[PDB]
């Protein structure tokens, strides 16, 4: 998983 | 998963 | 999954 | 996991 | 895990 | 750009 | 850019 | 840039 | 940049 | 930069 934000 | 935002 | 937005 | 944000 | 933020 | 392949 | 492959 | 591969 | 591979 | 590999 690459997660940017909320 | 690549997730940008909410 | 590539997800940009909400 | 790479996580930037909240 | 790489975590930047909260 | 989203690029999968070569 | 999101790039998977070569 | 998110790059997976070569 | 997030880079996995070569 | 986050770099995993060579």
From Swiss-Prot, chains A, B, C, D, E, F, G, H, I, J:
Residue ranges of the TM segments: none
Name under which the protein is recorded: Major prion protein
Interval of the full protein contained in this chain: 137 to 142 of 254
Family listed: Belongs to the prion family.
The organism of origin for this protein: Mus musculus (Mouse)
Entry comment describing in which tissues the protein is expressed: Highly expressed in the brain, lung, kidney and heart. Expressed at low levels in the liver and spleen.
Cellular localisation: Cell membrane; Golgi apparatus
PTM comment: N-glycosylated.
Disorder this protein is connected to according to its UniProt record: Found in high quantity in the brain of humans and animals infected with degenerative neurological diseases such as kuru, Creutzfeldt-Jakob disease (CJD), Gerstmann-Straussler syndrome (GSS), scrapie, bovine spongiform encephalopathy (BSE), transmissible mink encephalopathy (TME), etc.
UniProt free text on domains: The normal, monomeric form has a mainly alpha-helical structure. The disease-associated, protease-resistant form forms amyloid fibrils containing a cross-beta spine, formed by a steric zipper of superposed beta-strands. Disease mutations may favor intermolecular contacts via short beta strands, and may thereby trigger oligomerization.
Complexes and interactors: Monomer and homodimer. Has a tendency to aggregate into amyloid fibrils containing a cross-beta spine, formed by a steric zipper of superposed beta-strands. Soluble oligomers may represent an intermediate stage on the path to fibril formation. Copper binding may promote oligomerization. Interacts with GRB2, APP, ERI3/PRNPIP and SYN1. Mislocalized cytosolically exposed PrP interacts with MGRN1; this interaction alters MGRN1 subcellular location and causes lysosomal enlargement. Interacts with APP. Interacts with KIAA1191. Interacts with ADGRG6.
Function description: Its primary physiological function is unclear. May play a role in neuronal development and synaptic plasticity. May be required for neuronal myelin sheath maintenance. May promote myelin homeostasis through acting as an agonist for ADGRG6 receptor. May play a role in iron uptake and iron homeostasis. Soluble oligomers are toxic to cultured neuroblastoma cells and induce apoptosis (in vitro). Association with GPC1 (via its heparan sulfate chains) targets PRNP to lipid rafts. Also provides Cu(2+) or Zn(2+) for the ascorbate-mediated GPC1 deaminase degradation of its heparan sulfate side chains.
Phenotype of gene-disrupted mutants: No visible phenotype. Mice develop chronic demyelinating polyneuropathy after 60 weeks. Mice show abnormally low iron levels throughout the body, and are mildly anemic. Iron accumulates in duodenum enterocytes, suggesting impaired transport from the intestine to the blood. Mice deficient for both Prnd and Prnp have the same phenotype as mice lacking Prnd; they are born at the expected Mendelian rate and appear grossly normal and healthy. Females are fertile, but males deficient for both Prnd and Prnp are sterile, in spite of normal mating behavior.
């Amino acid at each position: 998983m690459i997660h940017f934000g909320n």
